[PDB]
Amino acid sequence: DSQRSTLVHWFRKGLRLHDNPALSHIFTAANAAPGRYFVRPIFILDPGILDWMQVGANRWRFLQQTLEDLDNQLRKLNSRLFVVRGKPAEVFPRIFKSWRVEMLTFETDIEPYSVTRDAAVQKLAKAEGVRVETHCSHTIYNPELVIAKNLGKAPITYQKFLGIVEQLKVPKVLGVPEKLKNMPTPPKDEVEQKDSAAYDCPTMKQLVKRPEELGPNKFPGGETEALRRMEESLKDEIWVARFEKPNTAPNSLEPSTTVLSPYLKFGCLSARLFNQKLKEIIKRQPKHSQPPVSLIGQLMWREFYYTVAAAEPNFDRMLGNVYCMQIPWQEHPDHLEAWTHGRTGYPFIDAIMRQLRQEGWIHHLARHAVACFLTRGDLWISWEEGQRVFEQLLLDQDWALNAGNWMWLSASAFFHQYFRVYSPVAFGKKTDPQGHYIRKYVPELSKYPAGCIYEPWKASLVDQRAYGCVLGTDYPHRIVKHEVVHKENIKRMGAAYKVNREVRTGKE
DNA sequence: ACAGCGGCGCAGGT
């Protein structure tokens, strides 16, 4: 085995065995040549970032669980995961030389960090005489090809995007990789000799530095659970078929929606397997919804955002963003901290922000409620700030998706009907009139009648006391007054829209 | 050139 070469698959995104052309390529190459190769499936933990703040304790746990599952699955194919600690730049040079790597394969990522990183690793491999074959399986449709077919522009409207995509071929969704035939463990590398457990899966302690920030384990990580959740979600085909996003409740105690997003984000679930499964159901169901409200529609929204983000490195900022509106957002530190910790004084908003911090997922409509309140609805705080918070607390934190959807809610891009402002009091009531959701996440107000649980300021002091929650002590006073402010922000929106319009006129 | 069209709010009705 001294004369063997190594074939390597690099997991960054796409943490699954199913529908992984990059991964499969290896496994099939290996057994095609039974005794000529050593297979290393690797994940590169950049350990320094653990102390980093744009990672929630909850998301760390999700990754930890994901890697363990991925290892277990790999184990069943006579292999294993290798979690290599270090920076790609300082690891790869060592591994190609020490393992004698012949091929490196990975799933392509459009994010700017990933672009610059991959380019660097492409360059390094090119010098070192290492073959690199990359595959595009994070999204159904390659954003590069979508732009191409729209004459080199990324479509900035959903209907237009659908028209472009439908005329593109949908790639074949693969199964799991084959069981490696005749594959002894690769000999320990310099680092493995010194410590055998070096490329083992990280323990919870190793990844979760601040475990007190962990909330209830509602959504376990990994491909196994992803597939399991999906199958259960697809069980009721009628539900699936007649699914319309706006008609789903943000405040229901159990999720109205699938909650497959985190799995789709980490690549524990293949968006192509999902698309494929959905299509099969629509076909068996005459009465069914269509885009953009339908469940396939929602998947196509993910693709939309991925395309537009691919064309713009400044996708996650107002400044230098081609799609984005230039709006004079204002600094309001105290207002920002209050919103971050769900102490706005608005129970519905506070409920949502708390669920987010505690569980790491909140319903899409709920995200709307909070985002609007923060950006154009009331506070007048920049969407970049909200994006920052969400990045920290979301399990399904996605650079393209989070950016794109925050612009939408701030009416900076992709949305423009700024007269439509969500009422932090009115919006919640329609689907949870009793205020059950508020009672759960803001238990301080759990004894309040439905008549003013959304609007505690409407209750007299004698009333508050009697409810066991006196405002200004046991609960925060509302930081702003929605009726006065939102109308005022509406005017500011129109002002900033006009200004952007001149700038456009002037370039011409 | 530019207007008509299609694109997850609220309140107050039937």
Place this chain on the structure above:
DNA sequence: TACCTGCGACCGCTG
């Protein structure tokens, strides 16, 4: 039930 319409006047795309 699941519509209707003022609100004040948005955008991108189309012909």
